[PDB]
Structure 1
Amino acid sequence: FVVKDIHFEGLQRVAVGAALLSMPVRTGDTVNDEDISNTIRALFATGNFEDVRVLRDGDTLLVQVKERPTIASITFSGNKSVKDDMLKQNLEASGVRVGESLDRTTIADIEKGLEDFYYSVGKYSASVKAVVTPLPRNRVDLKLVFQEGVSAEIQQINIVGNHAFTTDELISHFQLRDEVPWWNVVGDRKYQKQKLAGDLETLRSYYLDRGYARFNIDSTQVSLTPDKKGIYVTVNITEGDQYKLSGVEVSGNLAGHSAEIEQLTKIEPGELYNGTKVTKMEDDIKKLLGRYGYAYPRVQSMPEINDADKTVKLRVNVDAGNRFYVRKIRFEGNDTSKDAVLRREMRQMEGAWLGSDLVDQGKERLNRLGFFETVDTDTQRVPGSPDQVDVVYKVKERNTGSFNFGICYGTESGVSFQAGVQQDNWLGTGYAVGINGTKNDYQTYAELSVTNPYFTVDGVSLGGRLFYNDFQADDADLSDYTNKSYGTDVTLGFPINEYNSLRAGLGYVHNSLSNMQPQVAMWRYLYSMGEHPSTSDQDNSFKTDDFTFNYGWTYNKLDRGYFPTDGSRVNLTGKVTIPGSDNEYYKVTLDTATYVPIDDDHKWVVLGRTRWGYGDGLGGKEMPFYENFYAGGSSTVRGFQSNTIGPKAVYFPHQASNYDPDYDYECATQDGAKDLCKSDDAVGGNAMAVASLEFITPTPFISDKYANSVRTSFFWDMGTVWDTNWDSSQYSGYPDYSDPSNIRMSAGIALQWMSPLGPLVFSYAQPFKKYDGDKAEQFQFNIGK
């Protein structure tokens, strides 16, 4: 009868408080039936309700409202490149989603709120007409009409008030630019507030490093064209006087280290003011204090300006706090990884003064182990004392390492099994286990490699590999032979410096050479060995047990993985067969890759590569023909088929070559040429020399964002391979070639392109100097480099 309270129902996005104002009836009113029909009509006519039920339940109006139809479908009609999916998800994230009632007043509110939002973020997209289309049964269709005007592009970026620099110098280092990238320049035509703030911060940092300590940005106006397609950015900047540094005064608590702090400051008079030089001096003082255990210093530099003498001087307030001492180093989140694996990579020692640089070096060492997704560090000041720290390393375990089992079955191919187990942290220890296996009708490989880094706490690596290779003499003989080689290598490596590593080890190798073709270079070795193979007959069985002392060296300093730009990597691998083996020989291999940048942007890089190899026997023995060097192909001397640079086989008259498609087969298999024949197939040489010179450009036409994944290069390659034990003699086949002097020279273009299949490399090569017998390969595809 008289209204005491008025209630409303289910107003999730709808407003309960507004509904009482939108109802003409208030609390403290008196209602008749006529009024209840009038309130039901007014509440339906607000635009926010579909069913209105008003109950006079005693003296309290129970108003049960059913809202407007729920969102059912949203229709997408975006064209023009608008990325419509982003716009709909942005409307859903900034407002209504599924299960949110959608009203009929919100047709104007969505058009208005989208218009405000576009003006607020600067760049104007055409407004979406989010018309609410009524449907029966409490459902609604949201028909979004898209005008589709898009990507208001930067038109001009104006610097106003500059009188000592060109506009293009300042535009060049901005994130936002009007320029169109071809292969050197960069620029974003999209408008973004964060990129404009970055561009203003780079503009101040530039003017501060050019000697202006009074540089002020008076205003930054971003204006929109009436067509809504152009964005204008103007910056009103005021320059100051040129200031030269006269002297730096350091004051505060320097903890007695003034004779070291004051020698990293006091720039000599005649140097212009630079802000990044002040930041670098502050960070060098903070690092020098950190070296003495001060891990919480307060270094504050403020400039004293002189407008009379036109100079800037620096006051550096250095407050070195207490020394912090590490009490516990905690590793947390390592369920499978042993603590010794994480703790041995520490360069911060427990029970020692805290070095923040040492903690970050430990964190970088845990990250470059590769066993953890994310590695963090928490400098927890231990409760209860000023000078004590617990360094807690949060890690996340990876399922790194996998078992790949492949099986195939063909009609020319039987069951081709492949198996690969790569396990880093085997049994959760620091051991790395690599197992490889391949079964095929022409190939059987197996390898078990067990490596222990940190065998000794200094960081030495003890590895052991057990290998078994078995290759059959396939039809169409190409000097091929039934090889079965198996053995075990034990290798102890030790770092003699943070860039230099030395390696030593022993290897037992067995070889079984069977079904070998009568040919001069192989038999020159076999004759050096006690065996004199039967001259016509292919039937052979050469079995050697070889005990080799292996040694090596690595100098590795390269600025980045995959696409190094600076530094040098020098690898040396050699072996000497020790007394007690069947055959005795020595090999030396030297790989050098040096990347020299000729630019501060690190894109114009000169790469010099050198691969040299040499090897002879000991006493009257020769180097084994199965351990010779090969060149050509994509890694070395590109533009020739893989393994075709060097000495070629000189074949004796054979009896069996299996079946070669060619009627001639190898030299005089069945009847054929009585004289010794010249192969065009490389048999390998005792020595090799390869020199590559590469020029490196930014991608010739690639999105700079992808330029790190794509290395575009051009290249000039040179390679020679020669025998050292070749005695000159008159043959009817291959000419006497012991000369390193013949060199094969090629030039071309090389592409390196990262892919989800690993580093994929494509190259086009033109061999402009080659010899007879050598094959040519114009296109190269490979993995790695």
Structure 2
Amino acid sequence: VEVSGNLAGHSAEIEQLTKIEPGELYNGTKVTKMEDDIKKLLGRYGYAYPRVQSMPEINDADKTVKLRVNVDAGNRFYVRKIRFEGNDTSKDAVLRREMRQMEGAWLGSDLVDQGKERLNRLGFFETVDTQRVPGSPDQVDVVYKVKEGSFNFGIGYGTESGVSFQAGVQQDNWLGTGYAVGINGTKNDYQTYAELSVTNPYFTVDGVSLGGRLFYNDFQADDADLSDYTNKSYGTDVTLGFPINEYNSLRAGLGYVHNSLSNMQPQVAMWRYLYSMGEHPSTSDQDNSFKTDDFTFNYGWTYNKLDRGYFPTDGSRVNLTGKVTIPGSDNEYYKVTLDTATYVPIDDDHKWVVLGRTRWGYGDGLGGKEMPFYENFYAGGSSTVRGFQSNTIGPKAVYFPHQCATQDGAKDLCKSDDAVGGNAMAVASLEFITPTPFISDKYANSVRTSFFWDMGTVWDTNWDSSQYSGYPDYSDPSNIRMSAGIALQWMSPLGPLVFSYAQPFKKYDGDKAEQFQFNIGKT
């Protein structure tokens, strides 16, 4: 080595911070690092500009390289003002933390080089650009510059609801203040969702996030293979949200829902519920309007670890959510939904992938009253447990003789096999992802496939078998439903695609099946 210049106190530490072993040949990395262990440090001596540049005498005859490290130190310059122009929403506060020299401190260009870049990960700048006090040679600034509502239309097709539309306007900057306002609208066989939504991501300067949701879920049952009941429901929820980890979050809020239960196909499973609340209309005729207004408190949690957003095969994803009313509304209940996700890659080459998503739920009515039936859990279908028709798993209802009708001589509980759902849900599925063959091996690493063994068990936690002999006890703890098969998912300029074929191997009588299902657009 050699030192030629004023280091202000690193003159001897060259062989300790910037050392190599003699005999090592001319390197552009392990000799430049000798330059670059004192090129960044010197902003810890208040020195603003640490300059290290070393130009050896490249000697070839008997091959020694005599390094000559001209290090001249900077000087002690300070942090007066941080100035952003053109942007009416970005703050001088968060755009200080995402840089690494606070206001009122010894300042340097080279040790603010740890700050300028991360400011762009806000997701709203196109560029993130980067002063001695104007005409005064001691105090100094750090400055930046920034360069800164699109419709969207969705049309899909499918098996669970066939046709499917989306259309809504998003504008993630309300007049220059960072509020995220977004609208959405979806229509298909059973529900039509037309929602407005707002958010302020920084309620507190430190991260608290407040969203107020105005939704409307004009739903319908018969087209969705269930039994008969119609729902036009409107409600509004508001939730807080505060970051805690960047691997976590948390939320809490107050949620008011209002439902119009009507047009019910008389049947025991819901007619237990009507009594306990206090409504007993005619037991075989369908002109009845049960109205609920539920206020309900809600909360959640989250976790993210995946490395790649698109076609992810790493990390671990989690979710929790619960809910409970105050005991001062119409129906009183609570609800607990847990979610999981895990993409385990076994080696760096990343062709073997392991995935399995566990989900749990449970609900109950508190003071002896019952969970509303439209809030139950449904299992079986394409998106959760492939092979069995959508919703088809869940202890079936029992139609009354209504107008099972008295024209044919119906005078009892006509046993039915129609899916209704349930209140305790548990779905596991272990999936074992494998390479993509049969296409050119140049690009045979894209179109994903997997073999899967999906289970699903919803039951009525309060269903009776004292009173129903000829029927089984529909609360069996191990009435599992496994299935297997295949399916191919990928990207193409016509949206998200997948095609499937899954054989239902295990099931019980009364459990329908659906071997084949597809997805284009959205499901």
Note whether the superposition's TM-score is higher than 0.5: yes
The question of whether the paired residues in 2 share the 8 Å contact of 1:521 and 1:650 is answered with yes
Deviations 1:653-709 (A, max 9, x none): 221xxxxxxxxxxx3375364332344432111111111222233432456775675
Is the Cα contact below 8 Å between 1:332 and 1:392 reproduced in 2? no
| Contact 1:647 1:723 (C-alpha < 8 Å) held by counterparts | yes
1:784 counterpart residue number: 521
Candidates 271, 281, 292, aligned match of 2:34: 281
Question: Taking structure 1 as reference, are residues 296 and 471 closer, same or farther at Cα in structure 2, changes over 3 Å only?
Answer: same
Change (3 A) 1:754 1:273: farther
Match status 1:635 vs 2:383? yes
Query: For residues 295 and 411 of structure 1, do their structure 2 counterparts lie closer, same or farther at Cα, with a shift above 3 Å needed?
Result: closer
Q: How far off its partner does 1:323 sit? A: 6.9
| Farther off after superposition, 673-682 or 381-390 | 381-390
Q: For 1:752 and 1:442, how far apart are their aligned partners in 2?
A: 25
Gap change, CA 1:383 and 1:503, over 3 Å in 2: same
Whether contact under 8 Å (2:169, 2:182) holds in the other structure is yes
Structure 1 residues 402 and 348: alpha-carbon distance in aligned structure 2, compared to 1, 3 A threshold:
farther
TM-superposition CA deviations, 1:73-117 (whole Å, max 9, x none): xxxxxxxxxxxxxxxxxxxxxxxxxxxxxxxxxxxxxxxxxxxxx
Distance 1:500 1:440, change over 3 A: closer
Q: How far apart in 1 are the matches of 2:64 and 2:217?
A: 76
Post-superposition CA distance 1:451-494 (Å, at most 9, x none): 11001111111000111222356689841322111111010011
Distance 2:481 2:56 in 1: 63
Query: Per-residue displacement from partner, 1:400-429 (whole Å, max 9, x unpaired)?
Result: x42357999999999999752222112232
Aligned-partner Cα distance in 1 for 2:82–2:445: 37
TM-aligned CA distance change 1:297 to 1:650, over 3 Å? farther
Deviation, 1:270, is 18
SS across alignment from 1:253: coil
Q: Alpha-carbon deviations, 1:711-745, whole Å to 9, x = none? A: 34333322221222223244477532212311111
Q: 1:310 to 1:412 in 2, by over 3 A?
A: closer
SS of residue matched to 1:754: strand
Cα shift at 1:444: 5.1
CA spacing shift, 1:687–1:439, aligned 2, 3 Å: closer
Q: What is the root-mean-square deviation in Å for CA atoms of aligned residues? A: 5.6
Give the equivalent residue in structure 1 for 2:174. 426
8 A contact 1:331–1:395 mirrored in 2: yes
Deviation at 1:616, TM superposition (A): 1.4
Q: Distance in 1 between matches of 2:369 and 2:24?
A: 69
Task: Rate the CA distance shift 1:488–1:275 in 2: closer, same or farther, 3 A.
Answer: same
1:574, distance to aligned residue in structure 2 (A): 0.5
Structure 1 residues 414 and 315, CA gap change in structure 2 (3 angstroms): closer
CA distance in 1, matches of 2:15, 2:416: 74
Of Structure 1 and Structure 2, the greater helix share is in 1
Show structure 1 runs of 5+ residues with no match.
Answer: 1-247, 656-666
- Evaluate the alpha carbon distance shift between residue 622 and residue 416 of structure 1 in structure 2; reply closer, same or farther with a 3 A threshold: closer
Indicate the larger mover: 487-496 or 273-282: 273-282
Change (3 A) 1:590 1:406: closer
Residue aligning to 1:258: 11
**Among residues 335, 338, 343, which one is paired with 1:595 in the alignment?**
343
Q: Residue 262 of structure 1 aligns to a residue in which SS? A: helix
Does the Cα contact within 8 Å between 2:486 and 2:502 map onto a contact in 1?
yes
> Of residues 491, 506, 511 in structure 2, which corresponds to 1:769?
506
CA separation in 1, counterparts of 2:281 and 2:15?
Answer: 80
CA contact 1:617–1:623 (8 Å) conserved in 2? yes
Which residue number corresponds to residue 653 of structure 1?
401
The Cα offsets for residues 233-272 of structure 1, whole Å up to 9 and x where unpaired, read as xxxxxxxxxxxxxxx9999999889999999999999999
* Identity percentage of aligned residues: 100
- Scaled by the length of structure 1, the TM-score of the pair is 0.54
Give me the whole-angstrom Cα distance separating, in 1, the residues matched to 2:386 and 2:345.
23
Does 604-613 or 448-457 show the bigger shift?
604-613
8 A contact 1:296–1:320 mirrored in 2: yes
Paired residues of 1:338 and 1:428 also in contact (CA < 8 A): no
Distance between the aligned counterparts of 2:315 and 2:362, measured in 1?
A: 26
C-alpha distance in structure 2 between counterparts of 1:734 and 1:555, whole Å? 43
Q: Which moved more, 1:568-577 or 1:751-760?
A: 751-760
Matches of 2:158 and 2:433, distance apart in 1: 44
- How far has the Cα of 1:560 moved from its partner? 1.9
| CA 745–407 in structure 1, closer or farther in 2 if over 3 Å, else same | closer
Contact 1:686 1:725 in 2 (8 A): no
Alpha-carbon distance change, 440 to 641 in structure 1, aligned in 2, over 3 angstroms: closer
Q: Aligned pair count?
A: 522
C-alpha deviation, 1:518, in angstroms? 1.1
- CA change 1:737–1:417 in 2 (3 A) is closer
Cα 1:472/1:694, change in 2 over 3 Å = closer
Task: Name which of structure 1's ranges 527-536 and 485-494 shifts more when overlaid on structure 2.
Answer: 527-536
Task: Decide whether the 8 Å contact of 1:677 with 1:732 is kept in 2.
Answer: no
In the alignment, is the contact (CA less than 8 A) between 1:745 and 1:770 conserved in 2?
yes
- Correspondences of 1:343-492 after superposition (within 5 Å): 349-352=102-105, 367-375=120-128, 378-379=129-130, 393-397=144-148, 401-404=149-152, 419-437=167-185, 445-472=193-220, 478-492=226-240
Q: Do the aligned residues in 2 keep the contact of 1:591 with 1:609 (CA within 8 Å)?
A: yes
Distance (whole Å) between structure 1 residues aligned to residue 238 and residue 123 of structure 2: 24
Indicate how the Cα distance of structure 1 residues 456 and 335 shifts in structure 2: closer, same or farther if over 3 A, else same: closer
Q: Could you tell me how far apart the structure 1 residues matched to 2:106 and 2:79 are?
A: 6
Task: Say if 1:676 and 1:561 are closer, same or farther in 2 by CA, change over 3 A.
Answer: same
Maintained 8 Å contact 1:676/1:732: no
Contact 2:159 2:517 (C-alpha < 8 Å) held by counterparts:
no
Give distance in 2, aligned partners of 1:528 and 1:594: 42
Structure 1 Cα separation of the partners of residues 159 and 312 of structure 2: 45
Question: 1: CA distance between counterparts of 2:186 and 2:430?
Answer: 37
Helix, strand or coil at the partner of 2:119: helix
Q: Larger relative CO (CA 8 A, sep 6+): 1 or 2?
A: 2
Mapped to 1, the partners of 2:83 and 2:334 lie a distance apart of: 49
The 8 Å contact of residues 158 and 518 in structure 2, kept in 1 or not, is answered as no
Specify the SS of the correspondent of 1:761: strand
Structure 1 residues 358 and 254, CA gap change in structure 2 (3 angstroms): closer
Q: Using the alignment, how far apart are the partners of 1:391 and 1:490 within structure 2?
A: 39
- The structure-2 alpha-carbon separation of the partners of 1:758 and 1:455, relative to structure 1 and needing over 3 Å to count, comes to farther
In structure 1, distance between residues paired with 2:88 and 2:335: 45
1:712–1:620 distance in 2 versus 1, CA, 3 Å: same
CA contact (8 A) 1:574 1:589 kept: yes
- Separation in 2 of the partners of 1:385 and 1:726? 83
Q: Residues 766 and 269 (structure 1 numbering): CA distance in 2 closer, same or farther, change over 3 Å?
A: farther
The 3 A distance-change label for structure 1 pair 613 and 416 is closer
Judged with a 3 Å threshold, the aligned counterparts in structure 2 of structure 1 residues 472 and 574 are, in CA distance, closer, same or farther, namely closer
Higher strand share: 1
